[PDB]
Amino acid sequence: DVLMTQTPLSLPVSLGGQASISCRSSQSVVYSDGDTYLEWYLQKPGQKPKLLIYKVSRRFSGVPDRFSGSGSGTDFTLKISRVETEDLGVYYCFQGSHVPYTFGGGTKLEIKRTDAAPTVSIFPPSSEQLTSGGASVVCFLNNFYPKDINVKWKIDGSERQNGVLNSWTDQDSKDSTYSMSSTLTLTKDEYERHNSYTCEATHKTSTSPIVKSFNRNE
C-alpha cells in the first residue's frame, strides 16, 4: 500500500569505508501524531532481525554512532561510517505509520577485503555411509577471497563433472571471507571401482590450481 523502494540491491564498501543506503516511500510517512515512524533494521545471515534506527534520525540503545539516519518526506538515508566486518547483512527500511506496515526490499552489504587463497581439504566417504549403499566424497575450500572460484573433480585422472554439488557460505561474520563446499556423490559400487580421487581449486590468487588427493587403496 505505502510503497518502499530501496536502492541499491547490494552495496560493496571497503573496510573502514563509508556506506550510504537510500529508501524512498510512495507517500508521506508522517503519522497523525506528528512524528515520522521510519525505522531501519538489520538481519545478519542466520540471525533474527535487529533494530538500529527509529524515528527517522534517532539511534536505538546499543547502536554505535557510525550509524546515522536522516530523512525528509519521502526520501530517507541510512549512513554507516568506518564499516566493520560486523556490519555485514541486509538492511531494511520500515514504515510504521500506515497499516499495513511495509518493509523495503533490503540492501545487502558486501564488504571488500584483501585477497585470500583457499585452504583445501578432501574427505573420503565415511564408513557409515558406505555400509548403506552410498558414497559421497566431500571437498572444503575455506576462507578465500574474492567469491569467484572453480572446483574440478578428477577420478583416476579423468575429469568427472556430474554428481557434483556446489554451495557457498555467506560472507564470513568475522574475517569477511567466503568458504565453499563441493560434493561428488556416488553409489558405493562405482566408488569402489576406482582408486584415486582428486579435488582441484583454481582461484584468482594463483595460476596453478590447489590440488588435494587421496587414494582408496591407501
Next chain:
Amino acid sequence: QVQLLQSGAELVRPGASVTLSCKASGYAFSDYEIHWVKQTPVRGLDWIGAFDPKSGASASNQKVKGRAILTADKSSSTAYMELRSLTSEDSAVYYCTRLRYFGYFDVWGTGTTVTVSSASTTPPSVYPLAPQTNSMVTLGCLVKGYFPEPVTVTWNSGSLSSGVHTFPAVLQSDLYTLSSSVTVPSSTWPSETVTCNVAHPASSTKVDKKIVP
C-alpha cells in the same frame, strides 16, 4: 531478561492450517502488542499482522487474508497466529516481535521455519568426515537426506566456536544435504574429543557423531 520464544519449525501439508506460538517473558504482557513478520528465503521482510492484548484489536496485511487469525492468551501471556489453507507460497521463517504504542520492534523471537509440502519429515543421516603435519586439522560433518529445513550443527555442544563453517543446504529431489566444517590445532585431534551435534527440529531428532580417525 525480555525474550520471545517460538517453536523451532513446523512442517505443514498444503491446504492445512498452522498455529504459531510467540510467548513473552520479562515484562508486562498487555503493555506491548505482538506483531508477526514473514521473512522470505534470501530477503524480504513482510509484515503479516499484529494483536494488541490491551484493546483486543487485530490487523493483517492483505496478501494473506481470509486466512490469518491473530489471538493472544493473557492468562498464559502467549500470542498465537493461525494461518489457514496453506500453500508453498507461505513457507518462510515467521518472526514474532513486540511493540509498545508509538515504540518500535526492539525485541524479536527466534523465528519458526514453516515448510508447506506434501512430503514427510525425514531425519538426517549424520556422517563423520576425517582425512598435513605442521598443521591444524580440518574436519567435517555430513548431514544428508533430511526434510524439511532447518538443521542446527554445533561442535562440542557449542564449545567449539571458532573455525566452524556450516554450508547452506542444497535441495535436490525433495531432500536436503549440507556439510559442516571445523578446524582445530593438530595437537588437539584426535587427542581431544571433537563431536558434531546435529539437530533437526521438524523430526525432533538430535544426533551426535564423534569424529574418529
Next chain:
Amino acid sequence: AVGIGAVF
C-alpha cells in the same frame, strides 16, 4: 510503528 491498538 504507531501500533494497531493506539488510535482508539
